[model samples]
Target: PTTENLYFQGSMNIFEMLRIDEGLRLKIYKDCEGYYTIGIGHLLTKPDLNAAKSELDKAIGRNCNGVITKDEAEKLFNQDVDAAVRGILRNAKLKPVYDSLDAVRRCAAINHVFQMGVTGVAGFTNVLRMLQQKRWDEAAVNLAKSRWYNQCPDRAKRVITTFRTGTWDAYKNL
Candidate 1:
């Protein structure tokens, strides 16, 4: 089945049907070489990918204590793919918020952390102006604060879980 606006632009369809799940909407992202990445949207969170690889390794291990029945694996595979898609889009959304913060404040935060020397305006002037007018700028800025990093990954996780289960309780579990 189709979900509205799955593709960033409507010029072409960006979905791949999978036999594993009826609702599975895989989008194959390929390189110039034959190699490609298979996923939906939420799979981009760095943490989630590592976690999934770990889980998959355990699931297929000779001593597989994490082994699930075929039914269970199919369910998990669908969930993981969905989560990947959500995570990608979530981080993409964060870009604007990161940029909208007052340049000095944002630079200070980045400096305190990775010390990457992130100077100048964090976000673009047009973005800042929109955030200011929309009254979302400060909230957006606060999202990047060290403390908020804890919930950053979960933002996408929550959306993906919710999409799969149709419940907000997944956030509580997070």
Candidate 2:
């Protein structure tokens, strides 16, 4: 297995590129789909023990609602990201080919898993094979054919550029 440290860079870059905020909210706010979310976009139904203390603090801050400190939100973020990276490392197909890639492409693969969940991203059979084969451009094209692309066209375009150019700047571009 490769060092698996690649996914840490991927994780941080994903959060930065996605512009995710680390803030705890005591109030149950509606997400885009009207689902409840708090504390750096953590879904209410997907409870995390790390955030529980902060959530409770928020509840105590006010009679009913509160906010999580930045440190607490960041703690939760690291734990969640570590878990996601672990999932990418655990993928049998993905692990063997990991070190063959440069930094940018490694980030792309891991970030794809982070964004799309390991199970869902693993289903990109053609893309994964292309990655393993080092057919970078084709892999990017295949990545564009998914619902993730449709949902996040700008990010998809940037990642495709990263795949084709092998440049971190390309991946981080707006």
Candidate 3:
């Protein structure tokens, strides 16, 4: 009856967290319910329109669950593919529909990451600042803060790994 019936809440959360660059990652897992595949394939990996169309076909064929016809796949694939990869890799264009969601699903991930950093720094900073003013107990009170913000342990660990080990550039050697 409601959007939540179709995994809307869960899907929406992850979808909102997906980023422009992370579309590839989303496609791998977003096979059912939502349709964000073909376009991502073209933008990230295809060579030409024809190549994109063809590769998209193969990608959909490989990843899709139900009996999606090739024609249906090609048609759906082209529209999104063309929009995502226009000219150059950096010059790719997203539809106006996706404009409202610049961060897509990645916002929550990034926001939470920075949120952790901010809260951590704030807590510790307050403690240090209190100690500076001889308000030692206020500083010590923060030591008992609970970390309920870490509901997504797997994602949180990855965020930590990325932040601490420079996971962004770590793929350079791979």
* Candidate 2, residue 92: lDDT: 87
Of 1 and 3, the candidate ranking higher by lDDT: 3
Count of clashes, each model: 12, 1, 7
In model 2, residue pairs whose N, Cα or C atoms come closer than 3 Å (at least 3 residues apart or on different chains), thus clashing, are 26-66
Tens digit per residue, CA lDDT, model 3, 25-73: 3232222322233332223231234443455557565634323454654
lDDT of model 1, residue 35:
25
lDDT of 1 by residue, 1-174 (tens): 247433322331112112211132233332122222233221211224345445444544443332334454455455654443343234544344445545332322222221111222333344335444544444344334433233334323322232223222432311
Q: Order the candidates by lDDT, highest first — what do you get? A: 2, 3, 1
RMSD of each: 15.4, 7.6, 18.2
**Over the stretch 1-174, how does candidate 2's per-residue lDDT look in tens digits?**
247544544555645543332234544564444445555555444344445445545533533333556665555556556666788888887676666787767766655665567889778888878888889879878888888776657546666666666765553313
Among these predictions, the greatest TM-score belongs to: 2
What is the C-alpha local distance difference test score of candidate 1? 0.33
Best by lDDT: 2
**Model 1 ranges with Cα > 4 A deviation:** 1-16, 20-68, 93-174
CA lDDT scores, all candidates in order: 0.33, 0.60, 0.34
Clashing pairs in 3: 15-105, 16-104, 16-105, 17-105, 17-106, 18-105, 18-106
Candidate 1 vs candidate 2: which has greater lDDT?
2
Cα lDDT, model 1, residue 159: 25
